[PDB]
Scaffold this motif. Structure first.
Motif, PDB file in Angstrom:
ATOM      1  N   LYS A 193      -5.639  16.154  12.976  1.00  8.45           N
ATOM      2  CA  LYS A 193      -5.895  14.748  12.663  1.00  8.45           C
ATOM      3  C   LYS A 193      -7.061  14.574  11.696  1.00  8.45           C
ATOM      4  O   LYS A 193      -6.977  13.800  10.742  1.00  8.45           O
TER       5      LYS A 193
ATOM      6  N   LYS B  57      -6.864  15.472   8.045  1.00  8.76           N
ATOM      7  CA  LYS B  57      -6.049  14.491   7.341  1.00  8.76           C
ATOM      8  C   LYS B  57      -6.886  13.329   6.814  1.00  8.76           C
ATOM      9  O   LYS B  57      -6.361  12.395   6.215  1.00  8.76           O
TER      10      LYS B  57
ATOM     11  N   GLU C  22     -16.203   8.288  -3.533  1.00  7.84           N
ATOM     12  CA  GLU C  22     -15.975   8.344  -4.971  1.00  7.84           C
ATOM     13  C   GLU C  22     -17.279   8.281  -5.753  1.00  7.84           C
ATOM     14  O   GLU C  22     -17.411   8.906  -6.804  1.00  7.84           O
TER      15      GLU C  22
ATOM     16  N   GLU D  86      -9.180   2.873   0.961  1.00  7.65           N
ATOM     17  CA  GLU D  86     -10.003   1.980   1.733  1.00  7.65           C
ATOM     18  C   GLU D  86      -9.649   0.524   1.503  1.00  7.65           C
ATOM     19  O   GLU D  86      -9.578  -0.252   2.454  1.00  7.65           O
TER      20      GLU D  86
ATOM     21  N   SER E 184       4.623  16.845   8.969  1.00  9.19           N
ATOM     22  CA  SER E 184       4.289  15.673   9.759  1.00  9.19           C
ATOM     23  C   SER E 184       4.350  14.387   8.951  1.00  9.19           C
ATOM     24  O   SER E 184       4.530  14.415   7.752  1.00  9.19           O
ATOM     25  N   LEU E 185       4.187  13.260   9.624  1.00 12.57           N
ATOM     26  CA  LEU E 185       4.132  11.967   8.958  1.00 12.57           C
ATOM     27  C   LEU E 185       2.802  11.779   8.258  1.00 12.57           C
ATOM     28  O   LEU E 185       1.857  12.511   8.521  1.00 12.57           O
TER      29      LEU E 185
ATOM     30  N   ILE F  56      -0.716   9.923   6.929  1.00 12.64           N
ATOM     31  CA  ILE F  56      -1.770   9.357   7.723  1.00 12.64           C
ATOM     32  C   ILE F  56      -1.645   7.867   7.901  1.00 12.64           C
ATOM     33  O   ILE F  56      -1.484   7.367   9.002  1.00 12.64           O
TER      34      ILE F  56
ATOM     35  N   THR G 108      -0.229   6.762  10.584  1.00 16.23           N
ATOM     36  CA  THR G 108      -0.467   7.461  11.840  1.00 16.23           C
ATOM     37  C   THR G 108      -1.728   7.140  12.636  1.00 16.23           C
ATOM     38  O   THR G 108      -1.670   7.059  13.851  1.00 16.23           O
TER      39      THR G 108
ATOM     40  N   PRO H 154      -4.416   6.277  14.971  1.00 17.36           N
ATOM     41  CA  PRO H 154      -4.146   5.282  16.016  1.00 17.36           C
ATOM     42  C   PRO H 154      -4.975   4.036  15.872  1.00 17.36           C
ATOM     43  O   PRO H 154      -4.474   2.947  16.082  1.00 17.36           O
TER      44      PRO H 154
END
Ligand SMILES: *[C@@H]1O[C@H](CO)[C@@H](O[C@@H]2O[C@H](CO)[C@@H](O)[C@H](O)[C@H]2NC(C)=O)[C@H](O)[C@H]1NC(C)=O
Ligand code: CUO
Ligand code: CUO
Lengths: 118, 736, 366
Positions: A8, A11, A79, C9, C93-94, C96, C99, C101
């Protein structure tokens, strides 16, 4: 579940501060400050162990600590780290065991590491 | 597949294609050598081997001449690849001034490194098998004459092709292209019936293909000129003639056995040679000029009032040399000689246009104006001449061309090309030497000592106050590549400011070396008039602060490699090129660069063995031009590998901070670009920002594409590695 | 991929922004059009679902639909376009954004009509690569669409699975943020093709089959009640071909690692080897279902559909190469074979039989 949370994190785009560490013949605590406008914030901290009688050591690489969330608090986007126009710098206040004392900087300066997500 | 200069070939490459050629040649089949050597001329296979009337197959005196020979060269290429040569068919520049034929095709024999046996060189001779007499090819007689007399201002071959590259239209280019090429055929062939004097047996002599690999490259050069020129590059002047199936190639499976050439027997798609034919050349540089540099020379050329002697060249059966004379009064003058290539069974041919020959300087040295009364004399001598009547060929006519272009100005006012100091012309050498003297002559800020002084203890770090001092040259070493990118740029720009049109050259130390380049080793050199030593490329250079000359004593090596492996430096740089992210590369990148600094840096501390005194020896410029070149090779590799090339994500701290000495504008350095592009992030993209391109990015004979394979082949090995954790010590240390 | 923070963002907030306008739609009205709440009427005024799939004008409606959606983030820092994820490129995988949560706008949507956020149930060389490339192979637009639509809905099948509230269903798909993002991509694919044609000199901003239907105007984009002027302007078929006046740009129309010119070479390269395809007739059915092939496995493909959808029938066959299957059995297109199929409903059941008739089986050299 552990590897689930780990994958996670990879990513997400993250920013680290790299620290080459070595035995300074005494233990010490290393406080990390990143200064945007010469306005400084307590970003993170590192500890080093050592002694009068010590076995000299130099790390094979640098330990990392992520300033990723700290940057988010200062609202300076990842950035802007690449932009010379934008003003950001990295500073460390190295402070010894007995206090203060403090050590003149015997530890190499931290580096910004940008780890793009996968 | 990479086609290289004959001189650029390593002994590995030289031997490997010698075996390939040996195998291809040695044993005879329809897929063999002879069967291919017979494509061009005289078993007379066209229009068909059947029946009554047959002529030589190869196309000449027509706009499809280069198309045809591009296929034959490709046939030869594939045939050699299939028999174990990594390289495409190599070329030799005849445009380069040469006295005699290259050793590759000159030597009768050669030694086998493995067997230690001396066996026949395949490229010196070649059997002629369709006859039963044998052998019998023999290039032995070379006609008149190699260096002089022919033209020249200068180089017979160079001038004619320069004029060829000048023309806008394909056919206009084609005439000059072919007939100029015709000369080296007749020149190397001589009075001998075989070996390139005669259209019949020319392709049996192995030099033919090395010859026409060059010819093909020349077309590729002209093609790249046209896209820069922004004009069509295809053969529209003869549009119908492109759809005619190339005579021997289009034949069915028994007569021709190459797929790739048969599909392209219609030359319409032959133009894009890289896509369709899957090969390319090491350089498209013509002479010493780059392609953009190439258009400049033709502009200086096209700005003059020029007069020509135009020849309409049609097929006469024999192959012939015509010697041109300008007779304006009493005796006549020899202005040059052109050759027409042919045979008894030649396919009947005739040019639509006229071949223009310059005759401009014949007039001047005759004390004769353009419009004075003069005839042209020709004496046509057969190569087996038995000289021919002057009527054999229609009389030449004089053509007058007024100056033309205003295509200036040009966006390459900023553009440069960095070449090898080992490849330089004596003319180019002197031009560099004089320019550097003025660079060295200036003792204060705009001069050579200042840029060398950025390696000096002069304190700009920090400032205005700095309490205690150290040298301000960038090391550490994450930003090492970026800083020297700018240093080598300053060295270049200041050198350009002083009467020079080129970029800062380099030298390949990845490759083995006998001695330092000719440009450096000697204390004294001879100018055109003759001169005492400036030099100013000998280590002699005054450091104003130290008040001495930075002397550079060589070391005991450097030549270790055997046939098997690359030089130690080549191995190092490959390991450096391997890396994915910038820093892991950078560490290897420079530790490799530290070598020569210590190798030409002998016992003497004033040499470049120390990074404080290092930059005062001018080879530093050559070194870190090449050092910068490797860093550029990498950037192309990263693009090839689909990873970040003109940026990086490690050590942002130093990568976003402007350099200490370049960022101190404006009093300290004159460069517009090093001031504007002082941040390491800006200096990444050298192509757009610093407006200079390199000679080649090839490394030790390996192209970037081959490099990646070699990098990948090594990575398949299970290998151990020993790592070193290095800190900065004041001493300059060798560690074994 | 390749996004640089904070490029990521800005967007969530924008998606966050329109979650409730909620007046214009604000987002639920913008959702309804593909979604369940009834878009339009037969003249008898009966409920229709104003979904414009299953027809040849399939891309325009959507490609727009992104626009409607795309506009909707308007000056809400809608600083860049809806991103696309290239499902063609094989993925463990999918992605982000959809994804994470916590504190993420892409996780789910809500549905006033059902009182619930979306639920998604993902189900297990790259398959889509092979499938899309074929579509590109084709030169007729109509021929292209059938494959283009079917390659597409394969994902609405697999992303959603067995939840009524999901991407597998027509009714509530449009509700899930995942849907547009999949689209940008679908739209992108279409664009690539246009570039392809253009390369080939075939019509790209036009289309000769069928003249019928591109001219029919499109609701809701037609409707008076669409308070965006732009879409109505191109509400038509034939407009909406040139996406240039949209006006948006894709970062690059390159299929993975290929110049467009490169791409044709590729396809041209593929085309050498003679192939063998199977083509089905597919036609409307209320439910949505996946179909699994056999001779070894030859499968598979999926069809998107829901209750109260306009019925549709494709003019042309849908082709699926099965050559790998033959080699698998070592057959030569000569030895003759039974092509066995299966066809599951998205809900747990139940593989009802055709329905679809019989598959033809055809051979292409070569
Ligand atoms: C060298 O060149 C001469 C000049 O052409 C050749 O003589 C001609 O040969 C052709 C047949 O090949 C005859 O039809 C011409 O009539 C000849 N002309 C003249 C002027 O001789 C001669 O044959 C050649 N010599 C050799 C040994 O090949
Ligand atoms: O051209 Cu056929 O001969 Cu060099
Ligand atoms: O430049 Cu600093 O030394 Cu090679």
């Amino acid at each position: 579940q552990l590897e689930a949370l780990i994958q996670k994190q990879k990513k997400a785009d993250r920013v680290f501060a790299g620290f080459l560490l070595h035995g300074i013949k005494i233990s010490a605590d290393v406080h990390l400050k990143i200064c945007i406008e010469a306005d400084c914030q307590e970003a993170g901290v590192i500890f080093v162990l050592g002694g009068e009688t010590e076995m000299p050591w130099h790390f094979d690489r640098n330990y990392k600590m992520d300033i990723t969330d700290v940057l988010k608090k200062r609202n300076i986007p990842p950035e802007a780290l690449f932009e010379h126009d934008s003003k950001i710098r990295l500073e460390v206040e190295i402070k010894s065991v007995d206090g203060a004392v403090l050590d003149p900087n015997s530890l190499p300066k931290p580096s910004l590491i940008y780890a793009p997500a996968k | 597949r990479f086609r290289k200069d004959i001189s650029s070939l390593t002994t590995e490459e030289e031997y490997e294609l010698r075996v390939a050629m040996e195998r291809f040649m040695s044993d005879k089949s329809i897929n063999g050598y002879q069967a291919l050597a017979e494509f061009h001329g005289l078993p007379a296979k066209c229009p068909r081997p059947d029946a009554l009337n047959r002529v030589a197959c190869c196309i000449h005196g027509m706009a499809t001449f280069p198309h045809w020979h591009r296929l034959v060269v490709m046939q030869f290429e594939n045939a050699l690849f299939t028999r174990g040569s990594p390289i495409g068919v190599p070329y030799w520049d005849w445009t380069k001034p040469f006295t005699a034929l290259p050793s590759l095709l000159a030597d009768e024999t050669y030694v086998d490194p493995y067997t230690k046996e001396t066996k026949p060189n395949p490229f010196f001779k070649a059997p002629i098998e369709f006859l039963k007499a044998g052998v019998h090819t023999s290039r032995q007689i070379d006609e008149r004459l190699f260096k002089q007399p022919s033209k020249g201002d200068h180089g017979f071959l160079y001038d004619g092709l320069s004029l060829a590259f000048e023309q806008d239209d394909f056919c206009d280019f084609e005439v000059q292209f072919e007939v100029t090429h015709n000369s080296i055929h007749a020149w190397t062939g001589g009075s001998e019936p075989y070996s390139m004097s005669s259209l019949h047996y020319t392709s049996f002599d192995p030099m033919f293909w090395l010859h026409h690999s060059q010819v093909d490259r020349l077309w590729a050069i002209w093609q790249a000129l046209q896209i820069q020129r922004g004009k069509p590059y295809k053969t529209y002047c003869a549009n119908s003639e492109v759809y005619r199936p190339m005579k021997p190639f289009a034949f069915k499976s028994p007569l021709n056995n190459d797929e790739k050439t048969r599909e392209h027997s219609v030359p319409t798609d032959v133009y894009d040679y890289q896509a369709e034919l899957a090969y390319t050349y090491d350089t498209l540089f013509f002479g010493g000029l780059s392609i953009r540099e190439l258009q400049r020379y033709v502009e200086e050329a096209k700005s003059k009032d020029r007069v020509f002697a135009g020849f309409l060249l049609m097929g006469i059966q024999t192959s012939a040399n015509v010697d041109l004379f300008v007779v304006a009064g009493g005796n006549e003058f020899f202005v040059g000689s052109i050759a027409v290539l042919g045979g008894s069974k030649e396919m009947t041919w005739r040019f639509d246009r006229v071949y223009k020959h310059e005759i401009t300087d014949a007039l001047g040295a005759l004390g004769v104006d353009m419009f004075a009364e003069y005839t042209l004399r020709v004496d046509i001598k057969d190569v087996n001449g038995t000289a021919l009547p002057p009527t054999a060929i229609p009389p030449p006519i004089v053509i007058f061309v007024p100056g033309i272009a205003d295509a200036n100005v040009k966006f390459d006012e900023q553009h440069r090309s960095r070449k090898n100091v080992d490849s330089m012309t004596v003319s180019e050498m002197n031009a560099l030497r004089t320019a550097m003297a003025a660079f060295a002559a200036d003792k204060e800020v705009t001069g050579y000592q200042q840029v060398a002084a950025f390696h000096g203890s002069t304190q700009w770090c920090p400032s205005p106050d700095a309490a205690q001092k150290y040298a301000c040259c960038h090391h550490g070493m994450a930003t090492f590549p970026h800083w020297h990118r700018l240093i080598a740029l300053n060295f270049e720009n200041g050198l350009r400011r002083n009467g020079w049109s080129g970029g800062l050259p380099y030298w390949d130390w990845t490759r083995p070396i006998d001695a330092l380049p000719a440009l450096v080793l000697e204390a004294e050199y001879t100018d055109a008039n003759g001169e005492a030593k400036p030099n100013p490329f000998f280590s002699g250079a005054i450091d104003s602060i130290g008040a001495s000359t930075s002397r550079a004593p060589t070391e005991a090596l450097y030549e270790k490699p055997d046939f098997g492996k690359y030089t130690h430096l080549a191995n190092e740089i490959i390991s450096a090129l391997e890396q994915e992210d910038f820093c892991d590369f950078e560490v290897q990148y420079e530790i490799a660069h530290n070598h020569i600094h210590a190798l030409v840096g002998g016992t003497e501390a004033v040499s470049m063995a120390s990074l404080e005194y290092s930059a005062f020896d001018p080879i530093f410029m050559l070194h870190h031009s090449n050092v910068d070149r490797i860093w550029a090779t990498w950037q192309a590799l990263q693009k090839f590998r689909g990873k970040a090339y003109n940026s990086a994500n490690c050590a942002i701290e130093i990568l976003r901070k402007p350099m200490s000495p370049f960022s101190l504008a404006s009093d300290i350095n004159p460069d517009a670009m090093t001031r504007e592009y002082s941040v390491p992030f800006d200096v990444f993209n050298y192509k757009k920002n610093f407006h200079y391109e390199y000679d080649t990015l090839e490394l030790n004979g390996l192209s970037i594409a081959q490099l990646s394979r070699e990098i990948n082949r090594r990575k398949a090995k299970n290998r151990v590695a020993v790592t070193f954790m290095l800190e900065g010590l004041k001493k300059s240390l060798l560690v074994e | 991929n390749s996004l640089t923070p904070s490029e990521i963002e800005n967007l969530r907030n924008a998606l966050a922004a329109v979650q409730a306008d909620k007046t214009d739609a604000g987002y639920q009205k913008i959702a309804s059009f593909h979604g369940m709440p009834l878009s339009c009427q037969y003249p008898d005024g009966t409920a229709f679902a104003c979904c414009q799939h299953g027809m040849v004008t399939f891309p325009h409606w959507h490609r727009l639909y992104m626009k409607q959606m795309e506009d909707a983030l308007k000056a809400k820092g809608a600083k860049i376009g809806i991103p696309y994820w290239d499902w063609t490129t094989a993925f463990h995988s999918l992605p982000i954004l959809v994804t994470e949560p916590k504190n993420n706008p892409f996780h789910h949507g809500y549905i006033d009509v059902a009182d619930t956020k979306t639920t998604r149930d993902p189900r297990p060389q790259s398959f889509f690569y092979r499938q899309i490339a074929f579509a590109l192979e084709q030169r007729d637009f109509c021929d292209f669409e059938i494959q283009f639509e079917m390659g597409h809905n394969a994902i609405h099948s697999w992303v959603g699975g067995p939840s009524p509230y999901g991407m597998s269903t027509l009714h509530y798909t449009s509700y899930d943020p995942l849907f547009y993002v999949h689209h940008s991509n679908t739209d992108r694919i279409w664009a690539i093709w246009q570039a392809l044609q253009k390369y080939r000199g075939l019509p790209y901003n036009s289309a000769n089959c069928e003249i019928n239907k591109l001219k029919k105007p499109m609701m809701p984009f037609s409707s008076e009640d669409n308070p965006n002027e732009v879409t109505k302007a191109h509400s038509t078929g034939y407009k909406s071909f040139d996406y240039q006046q949209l006006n948006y740009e894709y970062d690059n129309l390159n299929f993975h690692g290929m110049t467009i010119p490169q791409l044709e070479v590729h396809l041209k390269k593929i085309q050498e080897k003679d192939r063998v395809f199977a083509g089905f007739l597919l036609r409307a059915i209320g439910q949505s279902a996946d179909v699994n092939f056999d001779v070894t496995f030859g499968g598979t493909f999926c069809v998107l559909g829901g209750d109260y959808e306009m019925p549709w029938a494709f003019d042309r066959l849908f082709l699926y190469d099965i050559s790998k299957s033959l080699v698998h059995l070592r057959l030569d297109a000569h030895d003759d074979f039974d092509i066995k199929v299966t066809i599951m409903g998205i809900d747990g059941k139940s593989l009802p039989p055709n329905l679809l008739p019989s598959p033809t089986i055809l051979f292409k050299p070569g």
